[PDB]
């Protein structure tokens, strides 16, 4: 009834608590099945943590865990690919409440299946069952698409950038709460007890959407689910209509969004593996401060975005955001000490003002009745970006480990030169 922000807050809390606990269970079960009584992390680096020798069994269990995360994530991604683009275009024809209630129920169901597997110590393949069951009903991707479409359907043309930044800042606040309230909960009797908050958060989101949420689709029509006019409505969004030079901009902004969120997703994960690296060797509290400072960039940018719009357009704000991300990811790449590592975190205080800008510039190119289809496409792109970021950056970091640590961060900074060029070119050519 206030808005759809609490829905995304609870769903993001559920997802950000689910990821580390699920991979921790994968570590526990896969190690136990092979008689490996050892630490559940990857191999350490420097500061005497080891003797330099490699562990054939720990590396094998780590590879197994990475492969099983890949398997469950790809299964979820494919079923979400085929479900989000069916439930979004439908959502813009029947309303946003059903498509924000179904995925929350699916998330609660996968949380229940995960709890059943963790408590019964069942095979890790039944995690894939919960992932597919949630993915069919639309997953956290569909919560994202429905929330962004609801914000796009309840705001002006000028207010979309700020009202999307507000919701994305709520997304990141939920991420911070997950990171530093399941970070210090997963350590203390963790891995099962913190998982009850995933089910609790998903149930709370389902109840809030079903009861306390206010529908924003003004003239709700009568549409049939399972029609094939929902898969056609994302194709006749990118290729057929909007021929008046606003069809190239959809592809270019989708490309910029892909690269930008790929860089963000990869660089968050390498952050703790780097912080507790060889010349840093951060303790448990320093990396907690690091995670917090990484997840305060969200709100500091919901502030810098709103402040900078008083003098600039809504695109140069994103250009400034991409220079803050590049200065941070180049500084962090060259950080061999804690003042230089935390300066990089501080420099990225406007890093997250470019994703909401791209989302809004996409949402202002489509009709008011296609904000479901557009953000279904965007959610699918953000899932693919998560997968690609994981693969690329977890392949770069081990390889460029004895040559230059932080090269993954510098490569992410280099990749951010393409969204900046794309967005600057798009604005300059149109305004000329």
């Amino acid at each position, epitope marked *: 009834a206030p808005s759809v922000e609490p829905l995304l807050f609870l769903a993001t809390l559920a997802l950000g608590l689910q990821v580390p606990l699920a991979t921790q269970y994968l570590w526990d079960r896969l190690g136990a099945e092979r008689g490996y009584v050892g*630490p559940n992390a990857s191999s350490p680096h420097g500061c005497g943590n080891g003797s330099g020798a490699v562990d054939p069994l720990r590396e094998e269990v780590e590879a197994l865990v990475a492969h099983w995360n890949l398997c469950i994530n790809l299964g979820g991604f494919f079923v979400g690919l085929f479900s989000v683009t069916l439930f979004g275009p439908w959502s813009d024809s029947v309303g946003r409440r059903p498509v924000l209630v179904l995925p929350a129920v699916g998330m609660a169901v996968q949380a229940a299946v995960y709890l059943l597997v963790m408590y019964l110590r069942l095979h890790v393949a039944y995690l894939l069952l919960g992932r597919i069951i949630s993915g069919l009903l639309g997953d956290y991707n569909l919560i994202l698409a429905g929330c962004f479409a609801s914000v796009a359907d309840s705001s002006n043309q000028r207010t979309r950038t700020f009202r999307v930044a507000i919701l994305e800042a709520c997304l990141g606040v939920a991420g911070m709460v997950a990171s530093v309230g399941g970070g210090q909960w*997963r350590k203390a009797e963790g891995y099962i007890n913190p998982f009850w908050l995933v089910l609790a958060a998903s149930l709370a989101a389902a109840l809030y959407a079903a009861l306390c949420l206010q529908e924003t689709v003004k003239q709700r029509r009568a549409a049939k689910l399972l029609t094939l006019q929902h898969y056609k409505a994302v194709y006749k969004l990118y290729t057929a209509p909007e021929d008046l030079s606003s069809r190239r901009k959809l592809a270019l902004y989708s490309l910029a969004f892909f690269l930008l969120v790929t860089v963000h997703f990869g660089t968050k994960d390498l952050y703790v593996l780097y912080e*507790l690296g060889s010349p840093l060797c*951060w303790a*448990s509290d320093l990396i907690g401060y690091g995670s917090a400072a990484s997840y305060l960039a969200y709100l500091s940018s919901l502030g810098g975005l709103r402040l900078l719009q008083l003098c600039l357009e809504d695109t140069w704000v994103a250009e400034i955001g991409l220079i803050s991300n590049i200065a941070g990811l180049v500084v962090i790449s060259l950080a061999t000490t804690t003042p230089l590592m935390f300066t990089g975190y501080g420099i990225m205080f406007l890093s997250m003002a470019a994703t909401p800008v791209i989302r809004a510039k996409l949402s202002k190119l489509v009709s008011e009745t296609e904000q479901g289809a557009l953000f279904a496409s965007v959610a699918c792109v953000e899932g693919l970006c998560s997968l690609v970021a994981t693969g690329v950056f977890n392949s770069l970091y081990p390889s460029t480990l004895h040559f230059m640590r932080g090269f993954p961060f510098l490569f992410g900074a280099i990749l951010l030169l393409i969204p900046a060029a794309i967005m600057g070119w798009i604005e300059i050519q149109d305004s000329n």
Partner: nanobody
Amino acid sequence: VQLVESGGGLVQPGGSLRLSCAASGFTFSRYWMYWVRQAPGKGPEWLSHMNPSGSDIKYTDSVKGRFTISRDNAKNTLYLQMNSLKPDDTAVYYCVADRRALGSPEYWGQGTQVTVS
């Protein structure tokens, strides 16, 4: 933070070395405790682990019912007693201290040198 082990040394086969590991620099009552031996010309051979209480005690097959991990949160000295020592047990026994979390560091020890012969 340092975990210092001292129970090693030359013991004839059929020995009863009691390894100790005194942790100074953290709580030691919130950390899981392991035991690893890097045998000469090999890699780590993780031997045991124990939760901050003593409820989750896990071994490998080459030490099951033969090595007996133990910790004293009061004394802050993790132990490990070794029965039926064989010249296959010659190694450098380390003493790591994880948190059984994916965003927490490992604190290896210096490593004693058991030379069963």
